[PDB]
Design a protein around this ligand. Structure first.
Ligand SMILES: Nc1nc2c(ncn2[C@@H]2O[C@H](COP(=O)(O)OP(=O)(O)OP(=O)(O)O)[C@@H](O)[C@H]2O)c(=O)[nH]1
Ligand SMILES: [Mg+2]
Lengths: 169, 857
């Protein structure tokens, strides 16, 4: 049981950091722009056996877009990430969503506001209204403090498997 | 290159399980694009319509050719435009276009979708130059009723994309609008076509403005979208409401007649619908309405002459809409730990917007509801009531909120004893909404105790409940402690005690542990002397706790177990950092504990996650201990260099800061560590990865070091004089706001460096002698630029250098500088008027007298 998960968002929002942590437990400090895509399998040992997300960690910088929305082909679910520290990264969320759904008709998508550990947010809970307009699930996340670390995958797994009682622990 | 070989690369790019194949294939596709675009485009168009190629490869053919035609970057877009126009032969253009149109009518919809995207991309390039004139007729004709379902669908889609990115199209707009709206009217078109039309209308809304600004076209369009709201199919309804929302956002101005004549009545009806998806759709419509009316209020406040005006749709509808929204608040999920977004949550958001938009007018219907459900049989009703109350704590004026909080609080506080988990969860939240918005509505003598008691109950309850209490305690401490007679401290011991209980939870389920640590952080942030014993209980607790987490290193458990632990150590460090940045009094006595713990933390593997936090924490501790930190400087040195070298990170800047402080707290004893620091500091600034902020930090720290280090700086003197000579001759990067304010920041940091150097080398004039000209050259820029000399501090420094330098060379070695006109004139300007303070004028006197001696030598 495996699913293709495309991970998208403006450059420097913490996509690779998020995934590498889930993969190995290492917190990458240096920001190194992803070149096209890094594909890595993540397995979660649930109460209903293991579920595997083949993660497509896509580039955020136009320069290094690679195949861009070519990577969305056959994606069964997605994570849109923005940086709560950077208003422009939330301003572009609607674009990321659009480019996704034009290729993946009807998939479950989680919206993540990363970097909530940083002191002064520039995008407070008040401004985060997109989940609401397009019936997505939103989470505050921090790839550094590990706030809600497993949530996006837990929610996706449930919706994907169609079982509301799925557990990770 | 063969069409089949090309098709295999495309398939391999996304379908190969071998990562090296994928990378190689993508690389080969890219160079083919660069070297022979003509061929790339052509082959792409052929794989698109190739029946032998897998779906994914055909879809990818269309998308990647499109990604070589259009671009998010506005220069790339012009480059790509021109490339297509000049490199692609007219023979190939027609071949590509013809293939795209064929692909557009494929019976396989995902191919037609991609073909729709490629067609739009080519239209962006060609239509502005009046090329591809055949397209509109094709596109509109494919929308004909007699055309088969798929041909209509993908064509409407293509029209959508086309308009949305648009820059014939304009003179074809009526035909587009009609073709789009046509495809949505008539109940008996295919669901997919009807859907495709509503979405195409959405994507096109901005580009049909001139159509929307005509009673005739607008009315037609609005008739169809309204009918679609009353489709039996749920998705078609969702598409319709989707357009209504956008239309309300984009074209609020024209909405009053449609509201009055239809929408007002249709949306009240559907808000009642027993289907949650339907009621949701219509709640969003009303939230949109509130949002655009709220933004209008801001707009009139800053442009009171604006010809725009609110129609007060919300206000006018409160009698109908708000009761129906309050009714939707009782549609929560039975499962207390579902968390799936539903119509009740949508209703709450909408009610907050109604409060924020209608203010006081919201009070009557909401208070009638609250009072009537706050103690009802059903938990859903009890929870909806406390939900409702918190949703109106922002919007009404301070008087009203205080009055009704005062009145309702006893009932609200009382709900912490409810059997329902949801009721308690929302009750705790409601408390925090009161605190965060109207803290001074909670009289210290008769309400604040009942609140604290409610929070302490909830910290011992289900974790979902305890999480909210922590956030509520944070709110309380924030909005209360800003009042001069702050009554919260009276309860600090009771709160800090219960918070630690929650922080000692077995796990961090539902963020109840992480919440508590964040609260403890706040309790510390806002601590005073009055509460030192309890602020000390916190540091004692977390230090013990940190040491405890370190007992078992990460590489013993599962990844999952490690990350939960590292979350806890991050949680602890937030508190530990705040304690050190307030009262080091309670950790100076155990300085070795913290440092012992910090050094251990930085020792072990997989520390990158806390490293910066620990570094920040040590720095702040070092600031306190002053000379007291020297006994650690040895073992801390590796980590300091580690931090300094991360020139792309902010951690390097506080590392520069750390050096500033220990150089100043120690002085002549910094000479023992001076060289290893400077060997790094002298590199940092010329590192191609150095941040902007780094340069002036480093420039200034040379000042610090030199003044404390004296003769020991000489080996680095020339290298530093080069760095701040290059810096002082650096012009703004452009002409903008920051451009110059940064350039000034740099210039002020050069000044810090010379001041520190002259101070440091008081006893060693021979070493400074070769640079007198360089410094006087910099002082000329000060005298020249108002952003420099008009700053009082900068002038007093500049004119003080003039004097101090003179005092070092009493043999007339440098007297030629003191006879220049600008120097006599600059000293004079500094002793004049008010601008410059007395301290500046007295330094300018000193410089004037020193300068007179130079001439008389
Ligand atoms: N403070 C803080 N920093 C974070 C957090 N998450 C990631 N970072 C940092 O943010 C930077 C961005 O990391 P990346 O993961 O490479 O960003 P990205 O989204 O993959 O960038 P692209 O590949 O260009 O799309 C790194 O320096 C991380 O250390 C966080 O939650 N809090
Ligand atoms: Mg990345």
């Amino acid at each position: 049981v495996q699913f293709k998960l495309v991970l998208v968002g403006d450059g420097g929002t913490g996509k690779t950091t998020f995934v590498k942590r889930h993969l190995t437990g290492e917190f990458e400090k240096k920001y190194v722009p992803t070149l096209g895509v890094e594909v890595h399998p993540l397995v979660f040992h649930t109460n209903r056996g293991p579920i595997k997300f083949n993660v497509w960690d896509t580039a955020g910088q136009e320069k290094f877009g690679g195949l861009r929305d070519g990577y969305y082909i056959q994606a069964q679910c997605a994570i849109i990430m923005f940086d709560v520290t950077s208003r422009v990264t939330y301003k572009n969320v609607p674009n990321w969503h659009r480019d996704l759904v034009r290729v993946c008709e009807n998939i479950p998508i989680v919206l993540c506001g990363n970097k909530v550990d940083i002191k002064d947010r520039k995008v407070k809970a008040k401004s985060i209204v997109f989940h609401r307009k397009k019936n997505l699930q939103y989470y505050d996340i921090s790839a550094k403090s590990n706030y809600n670390f497993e949530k996006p995958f837990l929610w996706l797994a449930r919706k994907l498997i169609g079982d509301p009682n799925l557990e990770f622990v | 290159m063969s069409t089949a070989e090309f098709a295999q690369l495309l398939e391999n790019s996304i379908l190969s399980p071998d990562q090296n194949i994928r990378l190689t294939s993508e690389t080969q596709l890219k160079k083919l694009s660069n070297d022979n675009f003509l061929q790339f485009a052509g082959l792409s168009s052929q794989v698109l319509i190739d029946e032998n190629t897998k779906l994914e490869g055909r879809i990818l053919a269309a998308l990647t050719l499109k990604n070589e035609l259009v671009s998010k970057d506005s220069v790339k877009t012009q480059q790509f435009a021109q490339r297509w126009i000049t490199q692609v032969s007219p023979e190939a253009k027609n071949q590509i276009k013809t293939n795209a149109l064929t692909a557009l009518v494929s019976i396989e919809p995902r191919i037609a979708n991609a073909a729709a995207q490629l067609i739009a991309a080519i239209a962006d390039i060609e239509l502005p130059h009046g090329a591809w004139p055949e397209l509109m007729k094709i596109m509109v004709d494919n929308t004909g009723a007699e055309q088969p379902e798929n041909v209509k669908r993908a064509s409407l889609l293509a029209l959508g994309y086309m308009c949305e990115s648009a820059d014939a199209l304009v003179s074809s707009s009526n035909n587009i609008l009609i073709a789009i709206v046509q495809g949505a009217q008539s109940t008996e078109t295919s669901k997919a076509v009807r859907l495709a039309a509503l979405n195409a209308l959405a994507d096109s809304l901005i580009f049909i403005k001139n159509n929307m600004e005509r009673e005739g076209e607008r009315n037609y369009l609005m008739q169809v979208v309204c009918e679609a709201t009353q489709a039996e199919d749920i998705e078609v309804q969702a598409a319709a409401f989707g357009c209504l929302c956008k239309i309300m956002s984009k074209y609020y101005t024209f909405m009053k007649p449609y509201m009055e004549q239809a929408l007002y009545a249709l949306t009240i009806a559907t808000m009642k619908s027993p289907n949650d998806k339907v009621a949701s759709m219509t709640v969003e419509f009303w939230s949109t309405i509130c949002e655009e009316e709220i933004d209008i209020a801001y707009e009139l406040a800053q442009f009171p002459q604006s010809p725009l005006q609110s129609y007060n749709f919300a206000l006018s509808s409160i009698k109908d809409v708000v009761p129906n929204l309050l009714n939707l608040l009782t549609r929560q999920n039975e499962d207390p730990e579902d968390d799936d977004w539903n119509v009740s949550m949508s209703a709450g958001a909408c009610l907050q917007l109604f409060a924020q938009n209608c203010g006081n007018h919201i009070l009557e219907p909401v208070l009638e509801f609250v009072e009537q459900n706050i103690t009802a049989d059903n938990w859903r009703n009890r929870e909806a009531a406390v939900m409702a109350f918190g949703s109106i704590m922002d919007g009404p004026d301070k008087v009203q909120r205080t009055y009704y909080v005062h009145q309702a609080l006893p009932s609200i506080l009382n709900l912490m004893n409810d059997q329902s988990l949801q009721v308690k969860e929302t009750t705790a939240w409601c408390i925090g909404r009161i605190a965060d918005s109207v803290a001074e509505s909670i009289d210290p003598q008769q309400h604040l105790p009942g609140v604290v008691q409610a929070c302490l109950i909830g910290l011992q309850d289900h974790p979902k409940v305890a999480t909210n209490c922590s956030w509520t305690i944070i709110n309380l401490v924030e909005q209360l402690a800003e009042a001069t007679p702050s009554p919260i401290y009276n309860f600090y011991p009771a709160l800090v005690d219960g918070l630690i209980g929650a922080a000692n939870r077995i796990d961090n389920e539902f963020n109840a542990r992480a919440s508590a640590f964040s609260a403890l952080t706040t309790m510390v942030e806002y601590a005073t002397d009055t509460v030192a014993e309890t602020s000390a209980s916190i540091s004692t607790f977390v230090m013990d706790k940190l040491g405890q987490t370190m007992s078992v290193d990460e590489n013993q458990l599962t990844l999952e177990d490690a990350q939960s632990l590292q979350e806890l150590q991050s949680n602890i460090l937030t508190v530990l950092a705040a304690v050190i940045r307030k009262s080091p009094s309670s950790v100076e006595p155990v300085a070795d504990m913290l440092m012992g713990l910090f050094f251990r933390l930085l020792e072990k593997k997989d520390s990158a996650f806390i490293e910066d936090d620990v570094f920040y924490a040590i720095s702040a501790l070092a600031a306190s201990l002053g000379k007291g930190f020297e006994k650690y400087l040895e073992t801390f040195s590796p980590y300091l260099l580690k931090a300094l070298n991360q020139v792309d990170s902010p951690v390097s800047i506080t590392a520069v800061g750390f050096i500033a402080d220990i150089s100043n707290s120690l002085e002549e004893d910094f000479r023992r560590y001076s060289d290893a620091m400077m060997n790094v500091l002298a590199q940092m600034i010329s590192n191609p990865n150095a941040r902007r902020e780094l340069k002036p930090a480093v420039l200034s720290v040379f000042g610090d070091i030199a003044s404390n280090i004296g003769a020991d700086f000489i080996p680095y003197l020339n290298d530093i004089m080069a760095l701040c000579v290059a810096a002082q001759n650096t012009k703004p990067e452009n002409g903008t706001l920051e451009a110059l304010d940064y350039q000034i920041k740099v210039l002020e940091a050069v000044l810090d460096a010379y001041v520190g150097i002259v101070a440091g080398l008081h006893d060693k004039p021979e070493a400074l002698f070769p640079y007198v000209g360089t410094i006087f050259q910099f002082i000329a820029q000060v005298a020249e630029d108002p952003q420099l000399y008009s700053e009082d501090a900068t002038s007093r420094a500049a004119v003080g250098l003039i004097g101090d330098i003179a005092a070092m060379f009493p043999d007339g070695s440098i007297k030629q500088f003191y006879g220049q006109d600008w120097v006599i004139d600059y000293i004079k300007r500094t002793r004049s008027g008010q601008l410059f303070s007395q301290a500046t004028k007295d330094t300018a006197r000193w410089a004037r007298e020193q300068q007179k001696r130079q001439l008389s030598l």
